[PDB]
Amino acid sequence: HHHHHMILCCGEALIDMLPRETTGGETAFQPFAGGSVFNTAIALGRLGVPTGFFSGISSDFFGDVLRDTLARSNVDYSFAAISNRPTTLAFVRLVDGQARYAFYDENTAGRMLSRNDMPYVDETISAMLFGCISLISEPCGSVYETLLAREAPNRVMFLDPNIRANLITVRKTHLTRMKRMIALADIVKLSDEDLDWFGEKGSHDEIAAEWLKLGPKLVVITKGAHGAVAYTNHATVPVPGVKVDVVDTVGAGDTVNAGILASLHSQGLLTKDALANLSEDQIHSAVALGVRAAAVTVSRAGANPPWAHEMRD
Amino acid sequence: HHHHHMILCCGEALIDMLPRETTGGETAFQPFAGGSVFNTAIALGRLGVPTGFFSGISSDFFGDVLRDTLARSNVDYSFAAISNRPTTLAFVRLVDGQARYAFYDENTAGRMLSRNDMPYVDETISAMLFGCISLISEPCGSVYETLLAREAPNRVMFLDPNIRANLITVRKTHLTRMKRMIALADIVKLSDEDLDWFGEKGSHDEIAAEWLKLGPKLVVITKGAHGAVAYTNHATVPVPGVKVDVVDTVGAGDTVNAGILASLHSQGLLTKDALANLSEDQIHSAVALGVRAAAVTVSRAGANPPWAHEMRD
Ligand code: NA
Ligand code: NA
Ligand code: NA
Ligand code: NA
Ligand code: NA
Ligand code: NA
Ligand code: NA
Ligand code: NA
Numbered sequence: 001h002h003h004h005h006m007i008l009c010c011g012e013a014l015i016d017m018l019p020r021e022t023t024g025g026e027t028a029f030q031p032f033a034g035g036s037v038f039n040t041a042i043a044l045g046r047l048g049v050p051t052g053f054f055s056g057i058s059s060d061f062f063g064d065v066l067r068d069t070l071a072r073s074n075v076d077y078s079f080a081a082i083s084n085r086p087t088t089l090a091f092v093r094l095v096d097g098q099a100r101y102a103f104y105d106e107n108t109a110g111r112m113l114s115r116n117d118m119p120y121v122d123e124t125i126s127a128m129l130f131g132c133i134s135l136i137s138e139p140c141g142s143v144y145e146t147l148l149a150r151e152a153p154n155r156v157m158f159l160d161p162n163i164r165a166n167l168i169t170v171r172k173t174h175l176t177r178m179k180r181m182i183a184l185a186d187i188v189k190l191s192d193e194d195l196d197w198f199g200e201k202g203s204h205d206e207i208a209a210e211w212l213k214l215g216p217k218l219v220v221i222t223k224g225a226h227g228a229v230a231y232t233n234h235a236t237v238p239v240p241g242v243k244v245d246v247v248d249t250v251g252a253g254d255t256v257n258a259g260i261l262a263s264l265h266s267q268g269l270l271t272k273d274a275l276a277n278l279s280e281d282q283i284h285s286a287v288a289l290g291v292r293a294a295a296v297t298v299s300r301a302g303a304n305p306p307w308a309h310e311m312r313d
Numbered sequence: 314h315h316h317h318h319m320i321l322c323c324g325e326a327l328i329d330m331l332p333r334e335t336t337g338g339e340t341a342f343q344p345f346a347g348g349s350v351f352n353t354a355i356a357l358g359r360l361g362v363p364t365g366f367f368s369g370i371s372s373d374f375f376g377d378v379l380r381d382t383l384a385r386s387n388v389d390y391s392f393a394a395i396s397n398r399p400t401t402l403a404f405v406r407l408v409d410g411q412a413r414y415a416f417y418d419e420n421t422a423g424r425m426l427s428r429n430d431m432p433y434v435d436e437t438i439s440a441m442l443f444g445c446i447s448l449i450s451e452p453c454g455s456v457y458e459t460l461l462a463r464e465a466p467n468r469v470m471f472l473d474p475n476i477r478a479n480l481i482t483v484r485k486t487h488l489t490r491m492k493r494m495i496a497l498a499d500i501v502k503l504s505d506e507d508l509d510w511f512g513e514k515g516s517h518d519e520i521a522a523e524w525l526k527l528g529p530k531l532v533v534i535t536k537g538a539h540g541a542v543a544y545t546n547h548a549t550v551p552v553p554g555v556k557v558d559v560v561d562t563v564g565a566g567d568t569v570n571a572g573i574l575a576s577l578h579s580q581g582l583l584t585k586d587a588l589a590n591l592s593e594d595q596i597h598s599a600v601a602l603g604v605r606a607a608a609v610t611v612s613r614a615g616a617n618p619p620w621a622h623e624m625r626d
Contacts, residue, residue, distance in 0.1 A: 017342075020335040028333050028341035060415050061406060086417050093374060102373050104399050106420035 002268040005126035007044055007261055008052035008079065008119070010144055011037025011134040012110050013066050014088035016250060016303075029091065031062065032250070033069040034303055036162050037131040039251040043258030043293065043305035045073035049265050054079035054119045054147075056140065058109035062087035081117035085109040090167060101166040105137065113140035118147055126270045127156035127261065133164055135181060136174050145181065152184040156270050159185035160257055163197040170197060182214055186275055189220040189257055205229070205236065217275040220287060222256055224249075230287045233276075237283045242295040251303025252294045258305060259290030315581040318439035320357055320574055321365035321392065321432070323457055324350025324447040325423050326379050327401035329563060329616075342404065344375065345563070346382040347616055349475050350444040352564040356571030356606065356618035358386035362578050367392035367432045367460075369453065371422035375400035394430035398422040403480060414479040418450065426453035431460055439583045440469035440574065446477055448494060449487050458494065465497040469583050472498035473570055476510040483510060495527055499588055502533040502570055518542070518549065530588040533600060535569055537562075543600045546589075550596045555608040564616025565607045571618060572603030 016034035019027055033042075037055070044051040053070055057063050057080045066087070070077045088111065089104035105111050121128075128151055135144050148157060161178045163170055175198055182188060188211060192204060200207050208219040208231035222228045227241035263286035264270050269278065296306035329347035332340055346355075350368070357364040366383055370376050370393045379400070383390045401424065402417035418424050434441075441464055448457050461470060474491045476483055488511055495501060501524060505517060513520050521532040521544035535541045540554035576599035577583050582591065609619035 020337065020339075020341050022333040022341065022343055023336060024333065026333075026343065028335065028343040029330075030335055030339065030341040061404075061413065062415070086415070086419060089417075091374075100374065102375070102399070104402075104417070106399060108419070 002126070002265070002270065004050060004124070005265070005270070006050040006052050006076070006124055007127045007129065007265065007270075008054060008121070008125050009037050009041035009044070009129045010054040010147060011035070011129070011131035012088065013038035013053070013055045013057060014090055014110065015062050015065070017089055017091045019093055031065065032303065033066050034090065034251065035088075036160060036254050037129060037134060038066070039254035039303040039305070040129060040131075040160070040257040041075050042069065042073045042303065043255045043297075044262060045070070045075040046305055046307045047258055047262040047293070048308045049258075049262050051075045052079050052125070053077040056081050056083065056108070056110040056113040056117070058082075058087040059084050060086060063109060079119040081113060083109045083112070085112055099166070103167045110134070111137050111140050113143045115143055115146065118143060121151055121155070125155060126265070127158060129158040129160070129257065129261070130181070132161045132178060133167065136168065136177060141177075148181065148184050156187070156272060156275065157185045158187040158189070158257065158261060160253070161188070161190050161194060162253060163194045165197065175199065182211055182216065185216050186272060187218045187220070187260070188216045189222065189253075189260065191222045191224070191253060195221060205231070217272070218278065218283070220256075220260065222253060227291050228256070228287055230283050232278055232283060234278065235280045235283060237280060237287060239284060239287045239291055242291060244295045244299055246298045247301050249298055251305065252298050254303060255294040255297040255305040256290040259293040260286045263289040315439070315578070315583065317363060317437070318578070318583070319363040319365050319389070319437055320440045320442065320578065320583075321367060321434070321438050322350050322354035322357070322442045323367040323460060324348070324442070324444035325401065326351035326366070326368045326370060327403055327423065328375050328378070330402055330404045332406055344378065345616065346379050347403065347564065348401075349473060349567050350442060350447060351379070352567035352616040352618070353442060353444075353473070353570040354388050355382065355386045355616065356568045357575060358383070358388040359618055359620045360571055360575040360606070361621045362571075362575050364388045365392050365438070366390040369394050369396065369421070369423040369426040369430070371395075371400040372397050373399060376422060392432040394426060396422045396425070398425055412479070416480045423447070424450050424453050426456045428456055428459065431456060434464055434468070438468060439578070440471060442471040442473070442570065442574070443494070445474045445491060446480065449481065449490060454490075461494065461497050469500070469585060469588065470498045471500040471502070471570065471574060473566070474501070474503050474507060475566060476507045478510065488512065495524055495529065498529050499585060500531045500533070500573070501529045502535065502566075502573065504535045504537070504566060508534060518544070530585070531591065531596070533569075533573065535566060540604050541569070541600055543596050545591055545596060547591065548593045548596060550593060550600060552597060552600045552604055555604060557608045557612055559611045560614050562611055564618065565611050567616060568607040568610040568618040569603040572606040573599045576602040
């Protein structure tokens with residue numbers, strides 16, 4: 001009965017433009033489907049969760065790449081708003097030792113979203129997910145914030161404040177905005193790197209405790225190779241990392257999101273009441289699935305999350 | 314004395330994003346410096362003509378590619394207006410048999426040019442050059458049109474209406490605008506493909522005759538492999554093509570522009586009076602240089618025009 005309820009992901013869908021060598025031996029940019037909320041919808045799709053995607057998607061050929069990717073991962077993107085504006089591009093370049101970024105998001109299909117584009121949300125939507133860059137950008141951010149505010153009292157809200165300082169150099173109004181978004185979330189997952197960008201005092205375990213009093217019932221901090229720690233009002237759950245050979249980490253965190261949600265969905269715990277009474281074991285299963293799933297992704301030039309027929313054992 | 318006068322190119326500078334294969338065996342886009350007026354400035358630079366470039370150039374890394382390319386071809390781009398807006402991108406993709414295009418020009422450094430950015434033009438500027446896409450785009454087009462109108466009475470104007478239907482599907486106001494630009498030009502060069510987009514009656518040789526009455530003293534129609542025909546009020550000059558093995562044709566026409574101008578510059582004929590009295594031989598030398606120079610470009614994945622120390626014999 002809970003099994004057919006949908007998780008509706010709301011946020012950015014973009015193209016990661018990553019440097020590769022041509023056969024001629026020179027630098028080119030290879031287009032990958034991407035975006036944190038997008039990547040999470042894909043991973044939820046591949047895990048067999050009924051998944052929706054609300055966003056602004058272009059009708060150009062890059063938009064085509066995104067819709068094709070969603071469709072092949074069984075994500076329902078009928079919610080999405082299609083226009084003739086271009087697709088967001090995120091450029092990564094290697095200069096000497098380090099990466100440099102260029103964010104091409106002028107007048108895009110994603111950025112120029114409108115209140116009128118807001119989707120109808122009925123009782124078959126058990127949970128919704130929001131991300132950082134789309135919530136912070138203007139004018140689309142106003143739309144997603146509105147949507148989050150409206151449905152927060154009705155449904156499970158998952159928030160991933162993935163700070164991308166490299167894409168958009170972050171300021172206070174961004175940390176200010178994100179902070180007042182946290183209040184509206186039931187589940188919050190962020191990396192230890194993300195949490196540091198918030199200027200808050202104390203231990204990581206201490207910060208999590210403050211946020212649990214702000215409305216979230218579950219806070220998850222991810223620690224790269226070292227796995228993650230999950231915090232609620234009833235427990236703290238360390239989950240060890242998994243050793244694997246890493247090609248890259250694009251979309252790794254997004255897969256963690258998906259595993260946590262898929263497990264809770266599967267366990268039939270995606271209600272506000274059930275999240276308030278999670279046992280230690282239920283928390284561990286969710287975060288562990290998240291970690292296992294991300295193990296696969298980092299292996300093969302992700303964002304390329306695992307199908308559920310992968311991870312079979 | 315005429316030898317130190319500068320040709321000032323005014324128009325777009327963009328990045329051609331062309332499909333290549335990665336070592337991994339998949340499609341990527343390789344960034345090339347490009348833009349018709351840009352390509353022409355480069356070629357004039359490499360031919361040893363004192364050359365200027367007025368345009369809108371980004372401060373991002375794509376903008377860096379363009380400034381580096383200009384600098385290494387000895388083009389003076391101090392006239393250019395630098396801002397923090399992104400660089401124009403022109404995507405080409407091969408789908409089945411044919412090419413498909415995507416033009417990414419939202420809120421760019423090039424497109425958002427202003428009246429205030431207009432350059433000071435003194436008596437050391439013998440000639441100026443304008444192109445199509447920048448003259449048609451808004452709001453930058455208003456700026457270039459203004460500039461052309463102001464300096465037309467003072468200096469030699471060269472106009473290249475290179476129609477790019479694939480980049481921007483062309484409408485009447487574009488043909489209307491281009492047409493009323495032609496009046497202000499002393500030299501006009503366009504391809505037979507370009508001329509067809511104008512809906513005008515009669516033979517190509519007939520059309521050229523009409524335009525010569527509109528103000529232009531010299532009209533050149535290029536015919537791909539078959540070379541070109543040059544028209545004035547005193548003569549008609551067929552110039553045969555050159556047989557070469559062609560890698561591509563990006564920037565070919567732009568090199569023709571440069572050779573015509575370089576030759577006239579060298580011959581000391583870049584004045585309104587001298588263009589009104591060109592002999593048959595003087596016309597032939599100019600257009601022939603244009604054709605020879607373009608022979609080199611089409612050979613090596615241009616826009617990559619010849620240095621004058623190439624073409625040495
Ligand atoms: Na397209
Ligand atoms: Na914008
Ligand atoms: Na966006
Ligand atoms: Na990966
Ligand atoms: Na940059
Ligand atoms: Na614009
Ligand atoms: Na432009
Ligand atoms: Na070429």
